[PDB]
RNA sequence: GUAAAGCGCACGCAGGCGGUUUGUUAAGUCAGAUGUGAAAUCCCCGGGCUCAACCUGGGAACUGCAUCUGAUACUGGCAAGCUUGAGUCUCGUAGAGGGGGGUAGAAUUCCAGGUGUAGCGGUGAAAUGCGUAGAGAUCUGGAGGAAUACCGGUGGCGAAGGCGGCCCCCUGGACGAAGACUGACGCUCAGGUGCGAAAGCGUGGGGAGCAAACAGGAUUAGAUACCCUGGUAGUCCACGCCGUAAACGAUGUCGACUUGGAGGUUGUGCCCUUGAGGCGUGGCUUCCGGAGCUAACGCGUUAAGUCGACCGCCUGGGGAGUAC
RNA sequence: AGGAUAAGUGCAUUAUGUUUAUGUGGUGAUUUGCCCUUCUGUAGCCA
């Protein structure tokens, strides 16, 4: 178990994120300013994560349909990368609302989506005006890239994995409205209140987004050894 | 302003004669020396109302300490009040 | 597309109706806005404002919004166990304990809102803004200051609330 | 200067929970000690001690059953200058016999239920809500 | 603020249901009519509406509504008035009872018939 | 806060009120005891008249009142503390607080002489204005009074409004720190006395520029608004007479308590003193946002939160901050 | 010779971003304003 906080004494930083005053309610779990700007360190996140690392164990016991949502300029690859497993679905293009609350319409549009995708990729999408077809193709690709998470997955996910807060406000906004428990990675410009499970950290890169949420940890890997007597008998391969 | 040699003379003449500046008689006699000092300024001119707020601070507080004192002992009060003069 | 809460009983309390205007930019369209209250028989925080082209499509929209992001809440007997003064956004309403010997005493759409709320015998005077849109919060704020019975002795009454989690 | 110290006592218990503290410490009247014992036995505080005399001080530990308890709403009703006394006929029933009124009688500080059962009156101190 | 402020410096006191101007501490009262006016309307209207000046017995004078086609009125006749503001006139705070004293009962009403002096449910 | 409504502000007697403990007293307090509180129309239980309305026995709200005995949990009285409130000495520090002194340079303006010729000015654009009696500008030297940048900032000071070149004398009031002392000396404040940004305004000082008025231009249905130009009292200084207002932490007074972070700028411990910084611990003063609050803006540790005592004030508008 | 932090080459109209005349009062869109639930119940109003 201890391996997950053996890695937080090893990464955790961003050296600040935004503003001189930052978000006051995360101040306890985090380091204060130095030389006319704001700096953060990995050191102030380990006393918090000495018990709070037990929540990665509760999203791995019921694991089957997980959704990694909220992409950013350096966080996008990390949303793909922690969700690289085959029980775990992900987007690569920015999320927008109604993808969980008007899920009705979205599932009608998925059902359209995989049909026009087999058509476009076989070559069967031709029109005597090539412009009207190639332009529909570019926009179909953006749908595929945006929806790829819920697209191949059996329905509304059993948790919602928000990596970013800073620009991907909506992914957290809709998770509270569907009542689905939240699995959150918060930065020093975001509060740890109003979400059910946290990693204290930063929102970018592989510093907190798969360093506890992968095979290198022990706490996402002892939750999953508790799935093997509840709904399955063997399922530990699927997941990271 | 108030200086070391006025303050020492006051401790010597009023309250205990060493190591006390805080007691009711001597506290009143230290305030007296600043009221006198303010009346020193008020012997150049009389449109000094922004300082007068302060004069009335030092008096109002003498009224507070004279009240306390006469409720503790009528001797310290009647001596002090006559030995520090003021009014006709 | 959301979870919803239900009651085994029908409420279709239409409280208000309005129309949307832009007046030059596309001129003025026929659209209406509507406010509709969905209780439970013992209460809900259920209040829904929605809008559409026509009055029927508009109310049914608003009736849907009165049962999503909302949960039911519950109170034993046709009275409230606290004399408290519920305020929500300048519409301020009052309650005091009472008998069963009195039922409702109220008018307009308010007598219909209080019946599902369980606070109709305790119904005392409203003050501040008492037009339809905000007067109807009885079953929301007046059930968030709530007290409800669970004791066998009045001198165990504060002890019994402490051990409910200790 | 604060002229009512039992309103101040209660404002410290109130802010105690609002800032989610586990103990709340304060200056301690004879009255205070005497009130804290009723609140302890009717289970609005969990426990307390009183210690020093050269600085006399009350430490109490809060109510919880929800994480943020009904201790955020306890208010003085018979205060300095707004003294109001109730007889054995006029005693305060608070919150349909869920809530307590704390009443200082001539026979000591107790809740309204025990003051009624004795048939005393007295100074009606504070109601819960 | 506190009850102490209110013992030490007492407040004012509102009443309601008594804010329509009225005289001799009573609902109806007699006076001699002094003058008849056709006068110009208040509110955006075009009805040149009809009012009387009345001289009441307690030494004051007030202006009161009249109406109905062909009603009898002269500038010396005794009529009874009842409080009731008229919101289309230059300051009519009373109306006149056609069925009272020197004037007799008239038609040309629907909406108040014990007022202005009328028989039957609508005939 | 802005809807009607925090006194203009400080200081504070009478009255209202009193952190904490011991001693003590028992004015108020509360319990107990006893006496009183007739009658029904009302209220509760009967009863009678063709029910009822009505009237009425027993009980009662009887709407009002008494003193003795006892208690001390509570407030009040009083004596000695306590510090957990406040007050005071030396030490240090910031600032346009107050009163009185000292002092320099440069634009507008003027005179003089030298050099020198036609526009200069004003503005949205403009004309009125000034000028060939030589203007405008420029070199040299004198005249004179308000005024004093940029540093100067969301700073800081004063009682609130209030304070602005720089310096000192006389002196206030605040800000920090250690040694030291007193030990509720406390809180609020009807009445109260005291006290002005500005102009108004008496006399004294003074006048370069600007200006109500008054003229004239420009504008236009005009043109008193809009905009300019001459031009006076005024502005500009000091005290003095009733102190007006947007006279404000817009938020009474003062205080206790409630996650912080950072800005401005400052005592002081610590730093590579590494840039108005960070950390340690106080400071006023401001951004940002959490618990809680608003109708909204907004507030949020300086509250508009949780409250405290005690005082001020409001009860639709207009007409009226006038009348009386 | 300190008018020598040399612009800290950190700097940009540098803090009112302004002015050349106006033209009355009300007026559009419905008579079922009705198509989600047992019991505790509802829109003229019901299981």
CSV table of N, CA and C in Angstrom, one decimal, chain A residues 141-218:
chain,number,residue,atom,x,y,z
A,141,UNK,N,-14.8,13.0,-37.6
A,141,UNK,CA,-13.5,12.8,-36.9
A,141,UNK,C,-13.5,13.5,-35.5
A,142,UNK,N,-13.9,14.8,-35.5
A,142,UNK,CA,-13.9,15.6,-34.2
A,142,UNK,C,-15.0,14.9,-33.3
A,143,UNK,N,-16.1,14.4,-33.8
A,143,UNK,CA,-17.1,13.7,-33.0
A,143,UNK,C,-16.5,12.4,-32.4
A,144,UNK,N,-15.7,11.7,-33.2
A,144,UNK,CA,-15.1,10.4,-32.8
A,144,UNK,C,-14.1,10.6,-31.7
A,145,UNK,N,-13.2,11.6,-31.8
A,145,UNK,CA,-12.2,12.1,-30.9
A,145,UNK,C,-12.9,12.6,-29.6
A,146,UNK,N,-13.9,13.4,-29.7
A,146,UNK,CA,-14.6,14.0,-28.6
A,146,UNK,C,-15.4,12.9,-27.7
A,147,UNK,N,-16.0,11.9,-28.4
A,147,UNK,CA,-17.0,11.0,-27.8
A,147,UNK,C,-16.4,9.6,-27.5
A,148,UNK,N,-15.2,9.3,-27.9
A,148,UNK,CA,-14.5,8.1,-27.9
A,148,UNK,C,-14.7,7.3,-26.5
A,149,UNK,N,-14.8,8.0,-25.4
A,149,UNK,CA,-15.0,7.6,-24.0
A,149,UNK,C,-16.4,6.8,-23.9
A,150,UNK,N,-17.5,7.5,-24.0
A,150,UNK,CA,-18.8,6.9,-23.9
A,150,UNK,C,-19.2,6.0,-25.1
A,151,UNK,N,-18.5,6.2,-26.2
A,151,UNK,CA,-18.7,5.6,-27.5
A,151,UNK,C,-18.7,4.1,-27.5
A,152,UNK,N,-17.7,3.4,-27.0
A,152,UNK,CA,-17.5,1.9,-27.0
A,152,UNK,C,-17.9,1.3,-25.6
A,153,UNK,N,-18.6,2.1,-24.8
A,153,UNK,CA,-18.9,1.7,-23.4
A,153,UNK,C,-20.4,1.6,-23.1
A,154,UNK,N,-20.7,0.6,-22.4
A,154,UNK,CA,-22.1,0.0,-22.1
A,154,UNK,C,-23.1,0.9,-21.4
A,155,UNK,N,-22.7,2.2,-21.0
A,155,UNK,CA,-23.7,3.2,-20.4
A,155,UNK,C,-23.0,4.1,-19.4
A,156,UNK,N,-23.8,4.7,-18.5
A,156,UNK,CA,-23.2,5.8,-17.6
A,156,UNK,C,-22.2,5.2,-16.6
A,157,UNK,N,-21.1,5.8,-16.4
A,157,UNK,CA,-20.0,5.2,-15.7
A,157,UNK,C,-20.2,5.3,-14.2
A,158,UNK,N,-19.6,4.3,-13.5
A,158,UNK,CA,-19.8,4.1,-12.1
A,158,UNK,C,-19.0,5.1,-11.2
A,159,UNK,N,-18.1,5.9,-11.7
A,159,UNK,CA,-17.3,7.0,-11.2
A,159,UNK,C,-17.0,7.9,-12.4
A,160,UNK,N,-16.5,9.1,-12.0
A,160,UNK,CA,-16.1,10.1,-13.1
A,160,UNK,C,-14.7,10.7,-12.7
A,161,UNK,N,-13.8,10.5,-13.7
A,161,UNK,CA,-12.4,10.8,-13.4
A,161,UNK,C,-12.0,12.2,-14.0
A,162,UNK,N,-11.9,13.2,-13.2
A,162,UNK,CA,-11.7,14.6,-13.6
A,162,UNK,C,-10.2,14.8,-13.2
A,163,UNK,N,-9.4,15.2,-14.2
A,163,UNK,CA,-7.9,15.3,-14.0
A,163,UNK,C,-7.7,16.9,-13.8
A,164,UNK,N,-8.3,17.6,-14.7
A,164,UNK,CA,-8.3,19.1,-14.6
A,164,UNK,C,-9.5,19.6,-14.0
A,165,UNK,N,-9.3,20.8,-13.4
A,165,UNK,CA,-10.4,21.7,-12.8
A,165,UNK,C,-10.4,23.1,-13.6
A,166,UNK,N,-9.2,23.5,-14.1
A,166,UNK,CA,-8.9,24.9,-14.4
A,166,UNK,C,-9.6,25.4,-15.5
A,167,UNK,N,-10.0,24.5,-16.4
A,167,UNK,CA,-10.7,24.9,-17.6
A,167,UNK,C,-11.9,24.0,-18.0
A,168,UNK,N,-12.1,22.8,-17.3
A,168,UNK,CA,-12.9,21.8,-17.6
A,168,UNK,C,-13.8,21.6,-16.4
A,169,UNK,N,-14.5,22.7,-16.1
A,169,UNK,CA,-15.5,23.1,-15.1
A,169,UNK,C,-16.7,22.1,-15.2
A,170,UNK,N,-17.1,21.8,-16.4
A,170,UNK,CA,-18.3,21.1,-16.8
A,170,UNK,C,-18.3,19.6,-16.4
A,171,UNK,N,-17.2,19.0,-16.6
A,171,UNK,CA,-17.0,17.6,-16.2
A,171,UNK,C,-17.3,17.3,-14.7
A,172,UNK,N,-16.9,18.2,-13.8
A,172,UNK,CA,-17.3,18.2,-12.4
A,172,UNK,C,-18.7,18.7,-12.2
A,173,UNK,N,-19.2,19.8,-12.9
A,173,UNK,CA,-20.6,20.3,-12.9
A,173,UNK,C,-21.6,19.3,-13.2
A,174,UNK,N,-21.4,18.4,-14.2
A,174,UNK,CA,-22.4,17.3,-14.6
A,174,UNK,C,-22.3,16.1,-13.6
A,175,UNK,N,-21.1,15.7,-13.2
A,175,UNK,CA,-20.9,14.6,-12.2
A,175,UNK,C,-21.8,14.9,-10.9
A,176,UNK,N,-21.9,16.1,-10.3
A,176,UNK,CA,-22.7,16.5,-9.2
A,176,UNK,C,-24.2,16.3,-9.5
A,177,UNK,N,-24.6,16.6,-10.8
A,177,UNK,CA,-26.0,16.6,-11.2
A,177,UNK,C,-26.5,15.1,-11.4
A,178,UNK,N,-25.7,14.2,-11.9
A,178,UNK,CA,-26.0,12.8,-12.0
A,178,UNK,C,-25.8,11.9,-10.7
A,179,UNK,N,-25.3,12.6,-9.7
A,179,UNK,CA,-25.0,12.0,-8.4
A,179,UNK,C,-23.9,11.0,-8.3
A,180,UNK,N,-23.1,10.8,-9.5
A,180,UNK,CA,-22.1,9.7,-9.7
A,180,UNK,C,-21.0,10.2,-8.8
A,181,UNK,N,-20.4,9.4,-7.9
A,181,UNK,CA,-19.2,9.8,-7.1
A,181,UNK,C,-18.0,10.3,-8.0
A,182,UNK,N,-17.2,11.2,-7.6
A,182,UNK,CA,-16.2,11.9,-8.3
A,182,UNK,C,-14.8,11.4,-7.9
A,183,UNK,N,-14.0,11.1,-8.8
A,183,UNK,CA,-12.5,10.8,-8.5
A,183,UNK,C,-11.6,11.9,-9.1
A,184,UNK,N,-11.1,12.7,-8.2
A,184,UNK,CA,-10.5,14.1,-8.5
A,184,UNK,C,-9.0,14.1,-8.1
A,185,UNK,N,-8.4,15.0,-8.9
A,185,UNK,CA,-7.0,15.3,-8.9
A,185,UNK,C,-7.2,16.8,-8.8
A,186,UNK,N,-6.8,17.4,-7.7
A,186,UNK,CA,-6.9,18.9,-7.5
A,186,UNK,C,-5.5,19.6,-7.4
A,187,UNK,N,-5.5,20.8,-7.9
A,187,UNK,CA,-4.3,21.6,-8.0
A,187,UNK,C,-4.4,22.8,-7.0
A,188,UNK,N,-3.4,23.6,-6.9
A,188,UNK,CA,-3.3,24.8,-5.8
A,188,UNK,C,-4.1,26.0,-6.1
A,189,UNK,N,-4.7,26.1,-7.3
A,189,UNK,CA,-5.7,26.9,-7.8
A,189,UNK,C,-7.1,26.3,-7.8
A,190,UNK,N,-7.4,25.2,-7.0
A,190,UNK,CA,-8.7,24.5,-6.8
A,190,UNK,C,-8.8,24.0,-5.4
A,191,UNK,N,-10.0,24.0,-4.9
A,191,UNK,CA,-10.3,23.5,-3.5
A,191,UNK,C,-10.5,22.0,-3.6
A,192,UNK,N,-10.2,21.2,-2.5
A,192,UNK,CA,-10.5,19.8,-2.3
A,192,UNK,C,-12.0,19.5,-1.8
A,193,UNK,N,-12.7,20.5,-1.5
A,193,UNK,CA,-14.1,20.4,-1.1
A,193,UNK,C,-14.9,20.2,-2.4
A,194,UNK,N,-16.0,19.4,-2.2
A,194,UNK,CA,-17.2,19.3,-3.1
A,194,UNK,C,-17.1,18.2,-4.1
A,195,UNK,N,-16.3,17.2,-3.8
A,195,UNK,CA,-15.9,16.1,-4.6
A,195,UNK,C,-15.5,15.0,-3.6
A,196,UNK,N,-15.6,13.7,-3.9
A,196,UNK,CA,-15.7,12.7,-2.9
A,196,UNK,C,-14.4,12.1,-2.6
A,197,UNK,N,-13.5,12.1,-3.6
A,197,UNK,CA,-12.3,11.5,-3.4
A,197,UNK,C,-11.2,12.4,-4.2
A,198,UNK,N,-10.1,12.7,-3.5
A,198,UNK,CA,-9.0,13.5,-4.0
A,198,UNK,C,-7.6,12.8,-4.0
A,199,UNK,N,-6.8,13.1,-4.9
A,199,UNK,CA,-5.3,13.2,-4.9
A,199,UNK,C,-4.9,14.6,-4.8
A,200,UNK,N,-4.3,15.2,-3.7
A,200,UNK,CA,-3.6,16.4,-3.6
A,200,UNK,C,-2.4,16.5,-4.4
A,201,UNK,N,-2.3,17.5,-5.3
A,201,UNK,CA,-1.4,17.5,-6.4
A,201,UNK,C,-1.4,18.7,-7.3
A,202,UNK,N,-1.1,18.3,-8.6
A,202,UNK,CA,-1.3,19.3,-9.7
A,202,UNK,C,-2.0,18.6,-10.9
A,203,UNK,N,-2.6,19.5,-11.8
A,203,UNK,CA,-3.6,19.0,-12.8
A,203,UNK,C,-2.9,18.5,-14.1
A,204,UNK,N,-1.6,18.8,-14.3
A,204,UNK,CA,-0.9,18.6,-15.5
A,204,UNK,C,0.0,17.3,-15.5
A,205,UNK,N,0.3,16.7,-16.7
A,205,UNK,CA,1.4,15.8,-16.8
A,205,UNK,C,1.1,14.6,-15.8
A,206,UNK,N,2.2,13.8,-15.7
A,206,UNK,CA,2.2,12.4,-15.2
A,206,UNK,C,2.7,12.4,-13.7
A,207,UNK,N,2.7,13.6,-13.0
A,207,UNK,CA,3.2,13.8,-11.7
A,207,UNK,C,2.2,13.3,-10.6
A,208,UNK,N,0.9,13.3,-10.9
A,208,UNK,CA,-0.1,12.8,-10.0
A,208,UNK,C,-1.2,12.0,-10.7
A,209,UNK,N,-1.3,12.1,-12.0
A,209,UNK,CA,-2.4,11.6,-12.9
A,209,UNK,C,-2.3,10.1,-13.2
A,210,UNK,N,-1.1,9.4,-13.2
A,210,UNK,CA,-0.9,8.0,-13.3
A,210,UNK,C,0.2,7.5,-12.5
A,211,UNK,N,0.8,8.3,-11.6
A,211,UNK,CA,1.8,7.9,-10.7
A,211,UNK,C,1.2,7.1,-9.6
A,212,UNK,N,-0.1,7.2,-9.2
A,212,UNK,CA,-0.8,6.5,-8.2
A,212,UNK,C,-1.9,5.7,-8.9
A,213,UNK,N,-2.2,6.1,-10.1
A,213,UNK,CA,-3.3,5.5,-11.0
A,213,UNK,C,-2.6,4.7,-12.0
A,214,UNK,N,-1.7,3.8,-11.6
A,214,UNK,CA,-1.1,2.8,-12.5
A,214,UNK,C,-0.5,1.7,-11.7
A,215,UNK,N,0.1,0.7,-12.4
A,215,UNK,CA,0.6,-0.5,-12.0
A,215,UNK,C,1.8,-0.3,-11.0
A,216,UNK,N,2.4,0.9,-11.0
A,216,UNK,CA,3.5,1.2,-10.1
A,216,UNK,C,3.1,1.4,-8.7
A,217,UNK,N,1.8,1.6,-8.4
A,217,UNK,CA,1.2,1.8,-7.1
A,217,UNK,C,0.8,0.5,-6.5
A,218,UNK,N,0.2,0.5,-5.3
A,218,UNK,CA,-0.2,-0.7,-4.6
A,218,UNK,C,-1.7,-0.6,-4.2
